[PDB]
Amino acid sequence: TTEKPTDAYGDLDFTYSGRKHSNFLRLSDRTDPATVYSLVTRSWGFRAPNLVVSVLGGSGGPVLQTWLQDLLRRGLVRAAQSTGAWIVTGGLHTGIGRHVGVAVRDHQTASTGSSKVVAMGVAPWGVVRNRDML
Amino acid sequence: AWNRVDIAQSELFRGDIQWRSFHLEASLMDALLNDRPEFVRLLISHGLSL
């Protein structure tokens, strides 16, 4: 294995209209997160967090229950939007990545909150579907 | 077609269906040909390519 400088970074648009550009980065695994914190909080532009909540689970692949869907829609996102927080999840659809993403889309639609919860996602490079456009 | 926002609103809050984009584009043409601006704001805020 040879260590090389990165090639995938910058903005990231989707086909859906009305939204800004997301930011991504191709990164080594054997590196330090201090330059990750400097890259996010300085170079892209993000505030300092007041709370970090990482959500794990997801034995129900296609459908999760409506009880937990009520929790993930309201009771997680209203606290991450009142306190000011980063919700760290996996950036792919599988598991509870969809139910978090649908919950953020539901909360961003259901109110004129004039802000969005900074939901950050990590993902391995190997399991992205169409990475050749990056 | 009924010009009732609450039905389409509640049916987009139902997390079972996995709404596909071509149904959203069909209902968007129903909202753009007729004069229903509130469905245009709702359906675009769900996420839809143009």
XYZ file of N, CA and C in Angstrom:
552
model
N 0.838 -1.191 0.000
C 0.000 0.000 0.000
C 0.874 1.242 0.000
N 0.548 2.203 -0.859
C 1.268 3.470 -0.910
C 0.336 4.604 -0.502
N 0.853 5.528 0.302
C 0.093 6.674 0.789
C 0.217 7.808 -0.225
N -0.917 8.300 -0.710
C -0.972 9.324 -1.740
C -1.851 10.485 -1.294
N -1.621 11.684 -1.827
C -2.549 12.794 -1.581
C -3.926 12.548 -2.186
N -4.916 13.235 -1.618
C -6.320 12.994 -1.913
C -6.697 13.513 -3.298
N -7.851 13.058 -3.778
C -8.378 13.538 -5.046
C -9.871 13.823 -5.050
N -10.609 13.498 -3.993
C -12.060 13.663 -3.968
C -12.426 14.532 -2.772
N -13.006 15.693 -3.061
C -13.309 16.718 -2.072
C -14.215 17.745 -2.736
N -14.531 18.800 -1.998
C -15.230 19.944 -2.541
C -16.730 19.868 -2.353
N -17.437 20.617 -3.195
C -18.888 20.621 -3.155
C -19.455 19.314 -3.698
N -20.761 19.162 -3.522
C -21.463 17.959 -3.952
C -22.923 18.333 -4.131
N -23.377 18.419 -5.373
C -24.788 18.652 -5.615
C -25.493 17.349 -5.958
N -26.796 17.361 -5.760
C -27.690 16.300 -6.167
C -28.642 16.843 -7.213
N -29.485 15.964 -7.740
C -30.438 16.386 -8.751
C -31.549 17.243 -8.160
N -31.784 17.141 -6.858
C -32.881 17.829 -6.205
C -32.564 19.312 -6.058
N -33.568 20.140 -6.327
C -33.381 21.577 -6.423
C -34.001 22.293 -5.232
N -33.438 23.455 -4.919
C -33.816 24.220 -3.753
C -32.832 24.166 -2.607
N -31.721 23.448 -2.759
C -30.796 23.179 -1.670
C -29.398 23.662 -2.029
N -28.532 23.713 -1.019
C -27.147 24.118 -1.205
C -26.302 22.951 -1.702
N -24.993 23.145 -1.675
C -24.053 22.089 -2.001
C -23.539 21.441 -0.723
N -23.603 20.115 -0.679
C -23.008 19.351 0.404
C -21.502 19.275 0.202
N -20.790 18.953 1.276
C -19.339 18.871 1.246
C -18.884 17.471 1.624
N -17.925 16.943 0.866
C -17.374 15.628 1.144
C -15.858 15.698 1.092
N -15.234 14.567 1.410
C -13.782 14.448 1.427
C -13.407 12.978 1.377
N -12.470 12.632 0.502
C -11.834 11.321 0.534
C -10.652 11.415 1.486
N -10.575 10.497 2.438
C -9.619 10.608 3.526
C -8.987 9.257 3.828
N -7.731 9.284 4.266
C -7.072 8.094 4.778
C -7.721 7.634 6.080
N -7.497 6.368 6.418
C -7.947 5.873 7.710
C -6.894 6.093 8.787
N -5.623 5.914 8.447
C -4.539 6.049 9.413
C -4.054 7.498 9.425
N -4.928 8.364 9.933
C -4.660 9.789 10.029
C -5.248 10.319 11.328
N -4.987 11.601 11.598
C -5.439 12.150 12.871
C -6.630 13.083 12.664
N -7.619 13.053 13.562
C -8.816 13.885 13.384
C -8.644 15.342 13.775
N -7.455 15.761 14.213
C -7.240 17.166 14.538
C -7.251 18.022 13.280
N -6.681 17.510 12.192
C -6.801 18.210 10.923
C -8.186 18.042 10.315
N -8.956 17.045 10.760
C -10.348 16.938 10.336
C -11.180 18.017 11.013
N -10.915 18.258 12.298
C -11.626 19.301 13.026
C -11.267 20.679 12.497
N -10.005 20.882 12.116
C -9.633 22.160 11.528
C -10.231 22.325 10.140
N -10.381 21.230 9.393
C -10.916 21.334 8.039
C -12.397 21.680 8.070
N -13.142 21.057 8.982
C -14.575 21.306 9.072
C -14.847 22.668 9.695
N -14.296 22.915 10.882
C -14.643 24.121 11.619
C -13.981 25.378 11.073
N -12.976 25.266 10.207
C -12.408 26.489 9.653
C -12.614 26.598 8.151
N -12.205 25.581 7.395
C -12.126 25.709 5.946
C -13.488 25.670 5.273
N -14.365 24.761 5.694
C -15.723 24.761 5.165
C -16.554 25.860 5.806
N -16.483 25.972 7.124
C -17.295 26.901 7.874
C -18.402 26.190 8.619
N -18.155 25.902 9.892
C -19.140 25.307 10.781
C -18.861 25.791 12.191
N -19.920 25.945 12.972
C -19.751 26.401 14.336
C -19.210 25.282 15.217
N -18.807 25.658 16.419
C -18.442 24.658 17.400
C -19.704 24.004 17.955
N -19.699 22.691 18.145
C -20.897 22.012 18.641
C -21.133 22.297 20.110
N -22.351 22.002 20.552
C -22.689 22.025 21.966
C -23.101 20.660 22.481
N -23.229 19.679 21.591
C -23.679 18.329 21.887
C -23.370 17.469 20.674
N -22.916 16.242 20.909
C -22.662 15.284 19.839
C -23.443 14.018 20.147
N -24.334 13.630 19.241
C -25.145 12.429 19.400
C -24.896 11.526 18.206
N -24.394 10.325 18.469
C -24.178 9.322 17.438
C -25.239 8.240 17.561
N -25.930 7.969 16.461
C -27.089 7.086 16.453
C -26.712 5.770 15.796
N -26.878 4.674 16.533
C -26.550 3.346 16.043
C -27.763 2.435 16.171
N -27.787 1.401 15.355
C -28.887 0.459 15.328
C -29.194 0.073 13.893
N -30.394 -0.464 13.685
C -30.829 -0.719 12.327
C -30.993 -2.165 11.906
N -31.453 -3.031 12.811
C -31.800 -4.398 12.430
C -32.981 -4.462 11.474
N -33.889 -3.492 11.539
C -34.957 -3.394 10.571
C -34.499 -2.637 9.343
N -34.198 -3.373 8.278
C -33.705 -2.798 7.049
C -34.710 -1.948 6.290
N -35.757 -2.573 5.729
C -36.720 -1.788 4.940
C -37.595 -0.848 5.756
N -38.217 -1.330 6.831
C -39.183 -0.540 7.589
C -38.792 -0.612 9.059
N -38.778 0.534 9.729
C -38.704 0.616 11.179
C -40.082 0.986 11.718
N -40.281 0.745 13.010
C -41.567 0.988 13.648
C -41.912 2.472 13.692
N -43.215 2.749 13.795
C -43.702 4.121 13.831
C -43.458 4.787 15.173
N -43.294 3.997 16.235
C -42.984 4.549 17.549
C -41.597 5.181 17.567
N -40.587 4.420 17.147
C -39.240 4.947 16.998
C -39.154 6.003 15.911
N -40.026 5.940 14.904
C -40.049 6.975 13.877
C -40.598 8.281 14.436
N -41.488 8.199 15.428
C -41.915 9.399 16.134
C -40.803 9.964 17.003
N -39.997 9.088 17.610
C -38.860 9.540 18.406
C -37.798 10.198 17.538
N -37.451 9.563 16.420
C -36.409 10.100 15.557
C -36.860 11.358 14.827
N -38.151 11.476 14.505
C -38.637 12.712 13.896
C -38.608 13.861 14.892
N -39.281 13.706 16.030
C -39.370 14.839 16.947
C -38.234 14.866 17.962
N -38.153 13.845 18.818
C -37.424 13.988 20.070
C -35.917 14.004 19.945
N -35.391 13.634 18.788
C -33.962 13.790 18.581
C -33.641 15.097 17.878
N -34.440 15.451 16.876
C -34.103 16.586 16.035
C -34.465 17.907 16.713
N -35.524 17.942 17.532
C -35.840 19.180 18.242
C -34.779 19.522 19.284
N -34.135 18.516 19.876
C -33.078 18.791 20.832
C -31.793 19.166 20.123
N -31.522 18.536 18.981
C -30.335 18.889 18.218
C -30.490 20.227 17.517
N -31.713 20.733 17.410
C -31.922 22.036 16.802
C -32.082 23.131 17.848
N -32.519 22.791 19.060
C -32.590 23.807 20.102
C -31.224 24.043 20.728
N -30.534 22.971 21.114
C -29.230 23.130 21.741
C -28.164 23.525 20.736
N -28.249 23.007 19.521
C -27.219 23.232 18.533
C -26.269 22.067 18.630
N -26.373 21.117 17.711
C -25.700 19.849 17.923
C -25.351 19.236 16.582
N -24.450 18.263 16.629
C -24.088 17.470 15.470
C -24.564 16.045 15.675
N -25.405 15.568 14.766
C -25.844 14.181 14.766
C -24.959 13.420 13.794
N -24.129 12.528 14.321
C -23.166 11.777 13.526
C -23.757 10.400 13.267
N -23.915 10.049 11.995
C -24.526 8.786 11.613
C -23.693 8.234 10.458
N -24.054 7.059 9.949
C -23.486 6.607 8.695
C -24.145 7.315 7.525
N -23.320 7.760 6.579
C -23.805 8.543 5.455
C -24.502 7.768 4.357
N -24.657 6.459 4.511
C -25.325 5.660 3.501
C -26.758 5.353 3.934
N -27.523 4.760 3.017
C -28.937 4.523 3.283
C -29.168 3.381 4.263
N -28.270 2.401 4.304
C -28.560 1.144 4.982
C -28.622 1.321 6.499
N -29.483 0.522 7.121
C -29.754 0.672 8.535
C -30.649 1.862 8.808
N -30.326 2.605 9.861
C -31.103 3.767 10.269
C -30.604 5.045 9.599
N -29.789 4.923 8.552
C -29.392 6.098 7.798
C -30.559 6.733 7.070
N -31.485 5.911 6.573
C -32.675 6.466 5.940
C -33.598 7.111 6.958
N -33.808 6.468 8.107
C -34.801 6.979 9.044
C -34.333 8.262 9.704
N -33.021 8.431 9.864
C -32.492 9.718 10.302
C -32.664 10.762 9.207
N -32.324 10.408 7.961
C -32.426 11.364 6.869
C -33.848 11.780 6.550
N -34.791 10.843 6.638
C -36.198 11.175 6.456
C -36.697 12.019 7.623
N -36.169 11.781 8.828
C -36.573 12.583 9.982
C -36.076 14.020 9.873
N -34.876 14.216 9.326
C -34.366 15.569 9.142
C -35.141 16.283 8.041
N -35.493 15.559 6.973
C -36.306 16.140 5.906
C -37.711 16.473 6.391
N -38.275 15.624 7.251
C -39.580 15.903 7.829
C -39.543 17.121 8.729
N -38.508 17.254 9.561
C -38.463 18.401 10.461
C -38.152 19.689 9.721
N -37.326 19.617 8.681
C -37.033 20.798 7.887
C -38.242 21.257 7.086
N -39.147 20.341 6.739
C -40.380 20.692 6.041
C -41.471 21.158 7.001
N -41.581 20.521 8.169
C -42.692 20.763 9.083
C -42.612 22.099 9.804
N -41.497 22.816 9.716
C -41.381 24.094 10.396
C -40.605 25.068 9.529
N -40.829 26.352 9.793
C -40.003 27.430 9.265
C -38.963 27.737 10.337
N -38.093 26.761 10.584
C -37.049 26.896 11.570
C -35.881 27.726 11.123
N -35.789 28.004 9.816
C -34.777 28.855 9.181
C -33.351 28.359 9.409
N -33.194 27.062 9.663
C -31.903 26.423 9.888
C -32.087 24.921 9.708
N -30.973 24.204 9.630
C -30.993 22.760 9.491
C -30.017 22.173 10.497
N -30.357 20.992 10.989
C -29.523 20.271 11.934
C -28.328 19.735 11.168
N -27.126 20.016 11.665
C -25.914 19.629 10.956
C -25.737 18.139 11.209
N -26.279 17.324 10.315
C -26.199 15.880 10.428
C -25.023 15.407 9.598
N -23.947 15.027 10.267
C -22.730 14.633 9.588
C -22.709 13.126 9.399
N -22.049 12.702 8.330
C -21.999 11.297 8.015
C -20.616 10.820 7.648
N -20.218 9.677 8.193
C -19.004 8.993 7.777
C -19.407 7.778 6.958
N -18.541 7.395 6.022
C -18.812 6.261 5.161
C -17.492 5.723 4.653
N -17.335 4.408 4.533
C -16.135 3.872 3.884
C -16.134 4.198 2.400
N -14.936 4.307 1.830
C -14.838 4.640 0.413
C -15.292 3.488 -0.467
N -15.118 2.254 -0.003
C -15.313 1.108 -0.867
C -16.741 0.772 -1.211
N -17.710 1.268 -0.444
C -19.089 0.805 -0.545
C -20.000 1.875 -1.166
N -19.426 2.942 -1.720
C -20.227 3.931 -2.435
C -20.589 3.394 -3.818
N -21.865 3.548 -4.199
C -22.406 3.042 -5.461
C -21.745 3.640 -6.696
N -21.871 4.949 -6.892
C -21.300 5.619 -8.059
C -20.294 6.636 -7.546
N -19.081 6.167 -7.280
C -18.027 7.057 -6.823
C -17.202 7.616 -7.970
N -17.430 7.147 -9.199
C -16.625 7.565 -10.341
C -16.952 8.971 -10.818
N -18.041 9.563 -10.334
C -18.347 10.964 -10.571
C -17.752 11.873 -9.506
N -16.784 11.371 -8.739
C -16.201 12.101 -7.626
C -14.680 12.116 -7.683
N -56.286 17.101 -7.030
C -57.522 17.402 -7.744
C -58.624 17.881 -6.812
N -58.607 17.439 -5.558
C -59.573 17.902 -4.574
C -59.196 19.237 -3.958
N -57.977 19.715 -4.223
C -57.414 20.945 -3.661
C -57.465 20.917 -2.133
N -57.087 19.777 -1.571
C -57.027 19.608 -0.128
C -55.596 19.288 0.258
N -54.964 20.206 0.981
C -53.544 20.099 1.278
C -53.262 19.027 2.324
N -54.186 18.827 3.268
C -53.930 17.986 4.434
C -53.768 16.520 4.074
N -54.434 16.065 3.012
C -54.299 14.675 2.591
C -52.905 14.419 2.032
N -52.460 15.266 1.095
C -51.146 15.087 0.479
C -50.032 15.309 1.483
N -50.248 16.240 2.409
C -49.296 16.497 3.476
C -49.129 15.270 4.361
N -50.246 14.707 4.833
C -50.197 13.527 5.688
C -49.681 12.298 4.948
N -50.009 12.157 3.662
C -49.509 11.024 2.891
C -48.026 11.136 2.578
N -47.457 12.338 2.627
C -46.008 12.456 2.567
C -45.348 12.264 3.922
N -46.096 12.374 5.020
C -45.497 12.025 6.302
C -45.541 10.531 6.601
N -46.177 9.724 5.757
C -46.229 8.284 6.001
C -44.938 7.653 5.500
N -44.131 7.141 6.425
C -42.808 6.643 6.105
C -42.741 5.210 5.635
N -43.822 4.668 5.075
C -43.805 3.276 4.645
C -43.568 3.122 3.149
N -44.022 4.079 2.344
C -44.249 3.849 0.921
C -42.953 3.882 0.122
N -41.997 4.728 0.533
C -40.821 5.113 -0.260
C -41.263 5.715 -1.598
N -41.828 6.924 -1.486
C -42.341 7.672 -2.630
C -41.293 7.838 -3.722
N -41.659 7.450 -4.941
C -40.754 7.523 -6.075
C -40.969 8.843 -6.804
N -39.997 9.223 -7.630
C -39.933 10.592 -8.129
C -40.953 10.837 -9.234
N -41.240 9.816 -10.043
C -42.150 10.002 -11.168
C -43.591 10.224 -10.720
N -43.979 9.703 -9.554
C -45.278 10.057 -8.994
C -45.295 11.512 -8.552
N -44.169 11.996 -8.021
C -44.082 13.392 -7.620
C -44.098 14.319 -8.821
N -43.530 13.886 -9.942
C -43.534 14.736 -11.123
C -44.905 14.749 -11.778
N -45.630 13.637 -11.686
C -46.990 13.605 -12.207
C -47.909 14.510 -11.404
N -47.849 14.417 -10.073
C -48.660 15.289 -9.232
C -48.211 16.738 -9.302
N -46.954 16.988 -9.669
C -46.507 18.357 -9.866
C -47.143 18.977 -11.095
N -47.284 18.214 -12.183
C -48.005 18.727 -13.345
C -49.481 18.934 -13.049
N -50.041 18.138 -12.138
C -51.397 18.414 -11.681
C -51.461 19.684 -10.851
N -50.373 20.039 -10.174
C -50.382 21.249 -9.370
C -49.993 22.484 -10.163
N -49.288 22.321 -11.278
C -48.862 23.462 -12.074
C -49.871 23.833 -13.148
N -50.536 22.848 -13.760
C -51.558 23.168 -14.754
C -52.754 23.848 -14.113
N -53.263 23.280 -13.031
C -54.270 23.952 -12.239
C -53.598 25.012 -11.372
N -54.404 25.877 -10.766
C -53.863 26.948 -9.933
C -53.887 26.511 -8.474
N -52.895 25.705 -8.107
C -52.687 25.288 -6.724
C -51.237 25.587 -6.389
N -50.952 26.753 -5.827
C -49.558 27.106 -5.535
C -49.021 26.398 -4.307
N -49.927 26.048 -3.396
C -49.520 25.487 -2.118
C -49.008 24.068 -2.278
N -49.503 23.346 -3.279
C -48.942 22.038 -3.566
C -47.602 22.141 -4.267
N -47.365 23.223 -5.002
C -46.078 23.391 -5.661
C -44.990 23.641 -4.628
N -45.300 24.460 -3.625
C -44.375 24.699 -2.524
C -44.139 23.438 -1.711
N -45.187 22.643 -1.500
C -45.042 21.438 -0.694
C -44.233 20.373 -1.420
N -44.543 20.123 -2.690
C -43.873 19.058 -3.421
C -42.425 19.379 -3.743
N -42.091 20.647 -3.973
C -40.690 20.987 -4.188
C -39.907 20.901 -2.884
N -40.529 21.265 -1.758
C -39.855 21.156 -0.468
C -39.633 19.711 -0.036
N -40.303 18.748 -0.667
C -39.989 17.350 -0.412
C -38.684 16.935 -1.065
N -38.308 17.571 -2.166
C -37.112 17.180 -2.879
C -37.444 16.592 -4.232
N -37.154 17.338 -5.294
C -37.542 16.938 -6.635
C -36.680 17.672 -7.650
N -36.159 16.933 -8.628
C -35.326 17.516 -9.671
C -36.172 18.311 -10.655
N -35.548 19.276 -11.327
C -36.262 20.099 -12.293
C -35.698 20.023 -13.702
